[PDB]
Amino acid sequence: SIVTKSIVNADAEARYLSPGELDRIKSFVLSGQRRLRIAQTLTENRERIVKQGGQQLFQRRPDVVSPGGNAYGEEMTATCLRDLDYYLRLVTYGIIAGDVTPIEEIGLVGVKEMYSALGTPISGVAEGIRCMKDVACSLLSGEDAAEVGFYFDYTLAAMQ
Amino acid sequence: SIVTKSIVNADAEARYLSPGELDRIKSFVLSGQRRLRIAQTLTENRERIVKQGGQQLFQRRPDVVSPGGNAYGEEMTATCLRDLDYYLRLVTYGIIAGDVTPIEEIGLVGVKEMYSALGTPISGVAEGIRCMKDVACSLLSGEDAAEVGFYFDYTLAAMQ
Amino acid sequence: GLRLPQIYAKAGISRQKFVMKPGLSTDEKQSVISACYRQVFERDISKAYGFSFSVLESQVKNGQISIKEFVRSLGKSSVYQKQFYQPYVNSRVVELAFRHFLGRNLSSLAEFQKFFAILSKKGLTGLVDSLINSREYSDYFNEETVPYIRGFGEEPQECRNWGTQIDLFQYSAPFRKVPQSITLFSDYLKALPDQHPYGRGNDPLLIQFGAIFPIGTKNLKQNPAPFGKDTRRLLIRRGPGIYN
Amino acid sequence: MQDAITSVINAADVQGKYLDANSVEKLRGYFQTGELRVRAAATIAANAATIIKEAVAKSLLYSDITRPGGNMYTTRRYAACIRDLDYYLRYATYGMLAGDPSILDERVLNGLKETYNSLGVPIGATIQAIQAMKEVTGSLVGSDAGKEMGLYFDYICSGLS
Amino acid sequence: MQDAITSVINAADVQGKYLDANSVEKLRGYFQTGELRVRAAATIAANAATIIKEAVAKSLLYSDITRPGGNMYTTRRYAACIRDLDYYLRYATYGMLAGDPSILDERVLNGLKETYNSLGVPIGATIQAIQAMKEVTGSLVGSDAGKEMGLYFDYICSGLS
Amino acid sequence: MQDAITSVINAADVQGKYLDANSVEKLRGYFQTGELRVRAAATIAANAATIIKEAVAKSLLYSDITRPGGNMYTTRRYAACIRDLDYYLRYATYGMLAGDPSILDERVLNGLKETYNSLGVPIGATIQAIQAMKEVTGSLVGSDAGKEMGLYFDYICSGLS
Amino acid sequence: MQDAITSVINAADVQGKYLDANSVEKLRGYFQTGELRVRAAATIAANAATIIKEAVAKSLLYSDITRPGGNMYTTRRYAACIRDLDYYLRYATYGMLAGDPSILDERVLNGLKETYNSLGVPIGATIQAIQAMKEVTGSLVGSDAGKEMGLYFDYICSGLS
Amino acid sequence: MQDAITSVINAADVQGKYLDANSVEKLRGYFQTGELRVRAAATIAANAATIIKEAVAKSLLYSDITRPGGNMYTTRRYAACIRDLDYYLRYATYGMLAGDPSILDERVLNGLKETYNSLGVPIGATIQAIQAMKEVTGSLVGSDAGKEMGLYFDYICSGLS
Amino acid sequence: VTKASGGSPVVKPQLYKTASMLTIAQAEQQDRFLELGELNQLVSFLNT
Amino acid sequence: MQDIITSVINQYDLSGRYLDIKGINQINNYFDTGLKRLMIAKLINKEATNLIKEASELLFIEQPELLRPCGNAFIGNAYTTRRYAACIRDIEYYLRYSAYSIIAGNNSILDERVLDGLKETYNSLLVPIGPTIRVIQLLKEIIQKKFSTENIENAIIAEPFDYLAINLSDKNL
Numbered sequence A, B: 001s002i003v004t005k006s007i008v009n010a011d012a013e014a015r016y017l018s019p020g021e022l023d024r025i026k027s028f029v030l031s032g033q034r035r036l037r038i039a040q041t042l043t044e045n046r047e048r049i050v051k052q053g054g055q056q057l058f059q060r061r062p063d064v065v066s067p068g069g070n071a072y073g074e075e076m077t078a079t080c081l082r083d084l085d086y087y088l089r090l091v092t093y094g095i096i097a098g099d100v101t102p103i104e105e106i107g108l109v110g111v112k113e114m115y116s117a118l119g120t121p122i123s124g125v126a127e128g129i130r131c132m133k134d135v136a137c138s139l140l141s142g143e144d145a146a147e148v149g150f151y152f153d154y155t156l157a158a159m160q
Numbered sequence C: 001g002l003r004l005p006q007i008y009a010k011a012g013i014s015r016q017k018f019v020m021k022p023g024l025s026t027d028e029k030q031s032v033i034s035a036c037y038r039q040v041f042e043r044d045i046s047k048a049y050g051f052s053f054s055v056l057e058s059q060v061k062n063g064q065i066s067i068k069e070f071v072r073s074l075g076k077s078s079v080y081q082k083q084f085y086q087p088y089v090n091s092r093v094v095e096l097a098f099r100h101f102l103g104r105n106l107s108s109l110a111e112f113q114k115f116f117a118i119l120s121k122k123g124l125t126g127l128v129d130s131l132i133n134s135r136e137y138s139d140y141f142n143e144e145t146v147p148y149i150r151g152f153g154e155e156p157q158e159c160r161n162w163g164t165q166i167d168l169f170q171y172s173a174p175f176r177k178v179p180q181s182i183t184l185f186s187d188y189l190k191a192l193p194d195q196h197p198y199g200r201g202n203d204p205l206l207i208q209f210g211a212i213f214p215i216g217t218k219n220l221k222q223n224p225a226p227f228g229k230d231t232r233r234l235l236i237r238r239g240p241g242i243y244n
Numbered sequence D, E, F, G, H: 001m002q003d004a005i006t007s008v009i010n011a012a013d014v015q016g017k018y019l020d021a022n023s024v025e026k027l028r029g030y031f032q033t034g035e036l037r038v039r040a041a042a043t044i045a046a047n048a049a050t051i052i053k054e055a056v057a058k059s060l061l062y063s064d065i066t067r068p069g070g071n072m073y074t075t076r077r078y079a080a081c082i083r084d085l086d087y088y089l090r091y092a093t094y095g096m097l098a099g100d101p102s103i104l105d106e107r108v109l110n111g112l113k114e115t116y117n118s119l120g121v122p123i124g125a126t127i128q129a130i131q132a133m134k135e136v137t138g139s140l141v142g143s144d145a146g147k148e149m150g151l152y153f154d155y156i157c158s159g160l161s
Numbered sequence I: 001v002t003k004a005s006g007g008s009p010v011v012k013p014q015l016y017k018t019a020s021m022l023t024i025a026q027a028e029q030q031d032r033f034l035e036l037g038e039l040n041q042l043v044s045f046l047n048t
Numbered sequence J: 001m002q003d004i005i006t007s008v009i010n011q012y013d014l015s016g017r018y019l020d021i022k023g024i025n026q027i028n029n030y031f032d033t034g035l036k037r038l039m040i041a042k043l044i045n046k047e048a049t050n051l052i053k054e055a056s057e058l059l060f061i062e063q064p065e066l067l068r069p070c071g072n073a074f075i076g077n078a079y080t081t082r083r084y085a086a087c088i089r090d091i092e093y094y095l096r097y098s099a100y101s102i103i104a105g106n107n108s109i110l111d112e113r114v115l116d117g118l119k120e121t122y123n124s125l126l127v128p129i130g131p132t133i134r135v136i137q138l139l140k141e142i143i144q145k146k147f148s149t150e151n152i153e154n155a156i157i158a159e160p161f162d163y164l165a166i167n168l169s170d171k172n173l
């Protein structure tokens, strides 16, 4: 959350929030309504987003679903689509929070360790997230898609 | 020196000298005259002090001058008396400084290492210093001898 | 961040600092190095047990290394890891290292998580390097001041690690073998524990014939918690749940 | 335990103060909703068994936890867990009547996570069963009383997680 | 820490005794098994990641603790627990090389139950993951080294319970 | 820490009082004995090592605690205990100069019994070594200063028992 | 519990020794002061209520801790604290009769700081009330018995701090 | 640091000599002026803030260096420079008490020109502010103490130039 | 409601300094054992 | 700490579900009062010194024993200038952190950075806890006198001070 981060950054210095931080909190609470609208649109179109992202991933990375691949079989493919749904949900959280704190605190800290322990290639997850980003930005307006892909790009950068 | 030590101990705390430290400096500069008198008496009776201390040491520790002892022979005995003269001079320095800083910075820091590297028993040096202390205190008044033995005792404690 | 009126610390007996300018007398150099020993090892081990660091002491007296580098290579010596690394668990090692190199206690749970992860992955030299290379160290001690204890009357304190910090600044600290700050900062965020309304030491061992209270003078594993007057312990039935 | 009235009186008494306008504000707020609270508590007392039955049926009745190897496989464990759900519903009703979750802290949540961890009871499934019970309870008591009850249901779930 | 040799020397020194026939018996016993111990330690260092992966897969990978509400749900918690399992394996290897579990007492078990209780980590699931790791480790190192390693695995599980 | 003067000033200040005749009585009492206190402190600083050596020789030097199995058998333990005795002597001298044992409470006795119990240090032998040190110290400083020093020696022994 | 006689007998028995001249010294010392101890214990039993009343009146009777918000505000808390002071006085009398503070360790100080910390009882005010009780008690029993009683009063205060 | 006494003792000790008549001459010279030195140091400690204020007012208060572009324009820089002047005054007082400028070499002048050159602090203005401080200080302490203090003020200015 | 406690030890804040006490603290912080210099740093304050 | 949005999102993450209309209504509740919360924050920043001066005066007028000698019971009150300055510093602390809490719409900053460990510190220093809460709700009244008829701002101001008062209290009942 933007409010939380402003409060901590002001708390470390032992000072009240300066007028710049209050200005930014004000601008955030004023834009909260379109934030909720965008989260609506992304939230309730989750099935198509996950499905079409899974397709673009499996066509771009046939090895992961090839015989023996990490997501090989019905159950493993279902689990991979489950992971993509996890990350779409986190992106909606980040959109409503106004900052990548929800995405980063849940799903980004220690993601490389987890996926290395599971035997999953992290580049495949990055490809899936990019495919979901294109599919989801296709359903938004220009400025809305720009603001929404803003978080997919951060999730991709953290997942290199 | 008392003034020097007060200045450093006040310098570490980043403060001026409190009235207690100034009181003590004042008392020191007021007693400087009898300090110089006592240093006079000890200084100019050095020959008898070293000689009679060397006797009491050699009668108390005949092994050091026995055949083969560390101070065995004319030259080694002369060198041991030289060391006793060194320490008497340092005691006069300490008496005029009002504190054992001169004695300890010259002749006490690392004395065990030196005497172990030379093969000299440090207990013999302590015995010689004690004998010189008795001889020197015999020539002073009651209060003067008390104040003068104050430094011989420190030199003995450091030389255990 | 905190704030304190400047005369609130000007009162009292004034903890003093030790600086290591080369060119000082030999007296001051010895006093500074011995203060460093007392800070890093909690007591002068050079005089008690004859431990010595010849190369380090000569290099620091000449000015080839600063007091910061001296403390850094003291913290990764064999003496330090024999006295304050081997007989402890890593969670306790972090807490003791913060007292020895920063003169203060852990502040946050995230701080513990960060430095425990560093110690986790890189060992003692990694932990010590991350501590002395921090901005806070240079803010308090820039290359020449021996680290000191930042007690109560020295700096504006926060009421969150109050008692834990006051207990860290004691000589009894190296005998609390259970970590004191990770557990405390964890229990701030959870409900009340399952224990007696009085201290944790008021619970006996449920054995055949007992009267055994393991917490006490010899253990020092003690955890008071605020239990209201109205409160009921969740007991487990010796038998099926439903006859509870 | 302390209800809303007890909490207001305590906040005023811990300062040597008489009950001023803000205390009157809170007290009026509680007194206005008391009758709705009594209605909801009566309705919940009426249908406790059906609420628990429907929540269990929608949350964990046909999952793998009820099969061999699951926690609540045997009849002992099934009965124990339905008794636990009855506890949660009754204490949430107490908290809703009192307007204060301190009874949940004193009588329910104190040492519950530790007991469940020692027994091996899955916490996530328990939280999901409580969430399903929240649905049915809000359903049965209507919107306002359902939000009131869901406050304490979420309090229990947060204290358990 | 003290190994078998240190323990024998300490038992002899605490009585002002020279090392007699029983000390020689124990010392020969350790010296005969040292080479097997080195072989096992090398093999375990070779395959630590795969051992932890297989133990997690057989013990708690698909249970409800990895789902929402479970302890190790988020990625932080998953990484933290696999790091914990790595700690346990490395310290069990140290104890097997030393032939003495005192390092486990000094560096692992001291204040571990209290930390896990304050954090809310389930102890039973941890003990079961360590038991699964014992299976894979004994599997990989063969019967004798597996019994040696299982000694210290069971030591950790008993100190944790 | 607070000395006699600080304690009198605190007792007067905690009542909003000016220093009346009883405070003057106590202050004169301290000022009359200050010079004897300084003499004793100087003499004790002169002979600390010999005092500790003689106390150890008369109290526990040839007993069974210095033999194998004893607390202070090895050289580490011998050095540690003589350092402890040096601590006790130095802090007793501080307390005698100040005329107030609060420094002993703040810097010595706070958590000392618990440390000794965790380490396994015998308390009775420590108290007896402090008693032997009291003998030598009173011996060296004469009757009045010896009673003054023995006050704080007995204070340490009572706080340790 | 062990008194002076029990402690001497234990020190002699733990070495397989017969009671030698030093044990006789300590035993005579206790036997000479026993009659004064009995006198003081009788006088203290006579005036316990007045001692506690006067100590409370001089230490914390009109401070802010007895006002709303304080620790001993309500009547329950006032009664509880005066009962605590009665406990302290009675156990100090036991310790003075026995000539050994082990009863204070076993029956009073064991787990007292932890109980007070869990309850929220201020430790400094308690120590000050015990100090005020020490004044009145020494006052009533005279100088020698007052020093004897103050030994154990200070023992309790040090164990509490 | 070394004062006059330390310097004389060092000159005598570096030759293996006893303190002869010339050392006595210098020592008497220092001992005669010590009391004047203490008086001056007390008076300077009394009026440090006013001395610095008046020196700054007469030297650089209304010049162009305090205007925009000047070294000490902002409030940070003004405070830093007045702190520097306080340093200079305090260390000159130390040197006057010691009768030896070695403390100025060890604690002040070592690497000062290089720091000022890296920061961009004008050296001429600093020397002029120190000269103005010398005027006020000699003014306040009288002729003899003013010459003594001006010795070390000029020492600092020469070491800075 | 606060759910944990780190304990409240007995604390005594510093109120003021004292010439009789400014000296013992200096030797006490350094283990300096009260030098002959500041051993003289009590007498005349007690002599006044 | 956590603001209201973060805590709602965390409640929904705990069960692993997306945001529905109930949580979205909860978020809208904050988004619709955010601007007046910022107005209150700016008012507090404009009047902090005067508000705390008034609060301290009104506290010391009705608790005059706080300014007198401690009584032998070594109580930490506002007796001397040192203790007086420390107490005014604490009053500024309370004002600052409840301003933070008003802006966040939540009380988690309060119990994480103010309440955790507060009573231990005050008990060890023997600081009065009754008058301490008294001054907090005095500050609350003084702030509320600026926005009186606008009842919603009245409750928004009442939240943090009342949380602090009910949590520093002991439970006599």
Ligand SMILES: CCC1=C(C)/C(=C/C2=NC(=C\c3[nH]c(/C=C4\NC(=O)[C@H](C)[C@H]4CC)c(C)c3CCC(=O)O)/C(CCC(=O)O)=C2C)NC1=O
Binding pocket: A064, A065, A069, A070, A071, A072, A076, A077, A079, A080, A081, A082, A083, A084, A086, A087, A106, A107, A118, A120, A121, A122, A123, A124, A125, A128, E061, E062, E066, E067, E073, E074, E075, E078
């Ligand atoms: C909220 C943040 C978060 C994430 C992301 C998460 C991931 C996560 N992914 C898992 C498995 C898995 N994930 C995958 C995923 C993939 N296979 C591929 O080839 C692709 C590259 C990729 C899909 C894009 C597969 C195949 C498994 C099963 C691995 C196995 O069981 O062998 C598991 C173990 C089983 C389970 O799902 O419970 C976890 C916990 N947990 C979290 O808390």
Ligand SMILES: CCC1=C(C)/C(=C/C2=NC(=C\c3[nH]c(/C=C4\NC(=O)[C@H](C)[C@H]4CC)c(C)c3CCC(=O)O)/C(CCC(=O)O)=C2C)NC1=O
Binding pocket: B064, B065, B069, B070, B071, B072, B076, B077, B079, B080, B081, B082, B083, B084, B086, B087, B106, B107, B118, B120, B121, B122, B123, B124, B125, B128
């Ligand atoms: C100012 C402080 C200071 C001291 C004390 C000092 C001592 C010192 N003592 C020396 C030798 C010596 N010192 C002794 C002394 C003794 N033999 C005994 O048995 C007795 C115990 C003891 C006399 C009391 C002897 C025998 C030697 C010659 C050793 C040799 O050459 O084998 C030497 C080597 C030769 C020389 O004198 O130049 C030094 C440097 N130097 C210093 O700068």
Ligand SMILES: CCC1=C(C)/C(=C/C2=NC(=C\c3[nH]c(/C=C4\NC(=O)[C@H](C)[C@H]4CC)c(C)c3CCC(=O)O)/C(CCC(=O)O)=C2C)NC1=O
Binding pocket: C089, C090, C091, C112, C113, C114, C116, C182, E065, E071, E072, E076, E077, E078, E080, E081, E082, E084, E085, E087, E107, E108, E109, E112, E115, E119, E121, E122, E125, E126, E129
């Ligand atoms: C060397 C001996 C040693 C151990 C073992 C140790 C453990 C330890 N485990 C921790 C957390 C943890 N440990 C786990 C572990 C588990 N979760 C499960 O469900 C499983 C049953 C289990 C793994 C098998 C988790 C999930 C956390 C994170 C807790 C949290 O983030 O709240 C933490 C908190 C530090 C942090 O991560 O910031 C410590 C200090 N410390 C030590 O010094």
Ligand SMILES: CCC1=C(C)/C(=C/C2=NC(=C\c3[nH]c(/C=C4\NC(=O)[C@H](C)[C@H]4CC)c(C)c3CCC(=O)O)/C(CCC(=O)O)=C2C)NC1=O
Binding pocket: C233, C234, C235, C236, C237, C238, C239, C240, C241, C242, C243, C244, D065, D071, D072, D076, D077, D078, D080, D081, D082, D084, D085, D087, D107, D108, D109, D112, D115, D119, D121, D122, D125, D126, D129
């Ligand atoms: C008033 C507050 C309170 C609660 C809640 C409480 C719970 C509690 N639950 C218990 C057991 C249990 N609890 C459950 C519950 C569950 N199993 C599942 O799979 C579900 C997720 C969950 C039900 C939703 C089960 C199966 C047991 C039996 C454990 C066993 O027999 O080993 C026991 C052991 C006592 C016994 O049955 O002999 C206690 C004390 N005690 C209390 O004082």
Ligand SMILES: CCC1=C(C)/C(=C/C2=NC(=C\c3[nH]c(/C=C4\NC(=O)[C@H](C)[C@H]4CC)c(C)c3CCC(=O)O)/C(CCC(=O)O)=C2C)NC1=O
Binding pocket: F061, F062, F063, F066, F067, F073, F074, F075
């Ligand atoms: C295991 C390591 C260890 C050692 C070494 C040790 C030494 C030790 N040596 C002692 C005494 C002693 N040691 C000696 C030794 C010597 N006299 C000489 O002239 C020679 C240079 C030297 C013999 C080579 C003497 C004479 C005493 C008795 C001193 C006395 O009582 O005055 C004592 C006191 C009495 C006792 O023996 O219990 C101890 C504790 N303790 C230990 O735990």
Ligand SMILES: CCC1=C(C)/C(=C/C2=NC(=C\c3[nH]c(/C=C4\NC(=O)[C@H](C)[C@H]4CC)c(C)c3CCC(=O)O)/C(CCC(=O)O)=C2C)NC1=O
Binding pocket: C171, F065, F071, F072, F076, F077, F078, F080, F081, F082, F084, F085, F087, F107, F108, F109, F112, F115, F119, F121, F122, F125, F126, F129
């Ligand atoms: C300033 C007040 C103060 C005291 C007194 C103090 C004592 C203290 N004594 C210690 C050990 C010790 N203390 C002793 C003392 C004794 N053994 C005996 O048999 C005798 C009865 C007794 C000496 C009279 C010994 C042997 C140890 C070492 C324990 C060990 O190595 O296991 C230790 C452990 C630290 C270490 O040595 O690494 C501390 C902290 N700390 C303090 O802050």
Ligand SMILES: CCC1=C(C)/C(=C/C2=NC(=C\c3[nH]c(/C=C4\NC(=O)[C@H](C)[C@H]4CC)c(C)c3CCC(=O)O)/C(CCC(=O)O)=C2C)NC1=O
Binding pocket: G061, G062, G066, G067, G073, G074, G075, G078
């Ligand atoms: C809220 C419940 C509650 C009560 C009732 C209470 C009573 C209480 N009454 C007290 C004193 C007192 N109370 C009285 C009362 C009386 N004298 C008479 O003759 C009459 C019979 C009676 C008046 C009707 C007197 C004279 C004192 C002072 C006694 C003394 O100091 O010697 C004191 C000690 C000083 C103080 O007031 O702080 C307390 C704590 N505290 C509580 O928390």
Ligand SMILES: CCC1=C(C)/C(=C/C2=NC(=C\c3[nH]c(/C=C4\NC(=O)[C@H](C)[C@H]4CC)c(C)c3CCC(=O)O)/C(CCC(=O)O)=C2C)NC1=O
Binding pocket: H057, H061, H062, H063, H064, H066, H067, H073, H074, H075
């Ligand atoms: C940007 C930050 C900043 C400030 C503020 C600043 C102030 C500043 N104030 C000065 C004088 C002054 N300024 C004042 C101001 C006032 N008297 C009052 O009663 C009022 C409260 C106040 C006017 C509002 C006075 C009285 C003097 C001269 C005092 C004197 O002559 O010593 C001078 C010397 C001017 C020169 O050298 O040409 C400077 C540099 N410099 C800075 O860099």
Ligand SMILES: CCC1=C(C)/C(=C/C2=NC(=C\c3[nH]c(/C=C4\NC(=O)[C@H](C)[C@H]4CC)c(C)c3CCC(=O)O)/C(CCC(=O)O)=C2C)NC1=O
Binding pocket: C004, C152, C155, C156, C157, C158, C159, C160, I013, J066, J075, J076, J077, J078, J079, J083, J084, J086, J087, J088, J090, J091, J093, J097, J113, J114, J115, J118, J121, J125, J127, J128, J129, J131, J132, J135
């Ligand atoms: C942000 C959360 C937070 C708080 C609140 C806090 C309080 C706090 N209050 C303190 C002291 C104090 N506080 C007071 C306060 C008062 N005296 C009275 O009579 C009144 C009841 C009250 C004023 C309203 C006094 C007098 C002291 C000094 C006590 C002493 O030194 O004797 C101190 C010790 C000095 C310091 O290190 O700062 C702390 C840490 N710390 C924190 O981190």
Ligand SMILES: CCC1=C(C)/C(=C/C2=NC(=C\c3[nH]c(/C=C4\NC(=O)[C@H](C)[C@H]4CC)c(C)c3CCC(=O)O)/C(CCC(=O)O)=C2C)NC1=O
Binding pocket: J067, J079, J080, J081, J082, J084
């Ligand atoms: C012993 C050192 C010491 C002093 C002197 C001290 C004074 C002090 N004076 C105060 C107030 C006050 N003091 C005064 C008046 C005056 N004060 C004077 O010294 C003048 C005689 C007079 C002005 C002519 C007034 C009118 C107040 C009320 C504060 C206000 O409302 O502004 C207060 C605030 C609490 C109170 O009202 O009592 C303190 C703490 N504190 C200390 O620790």
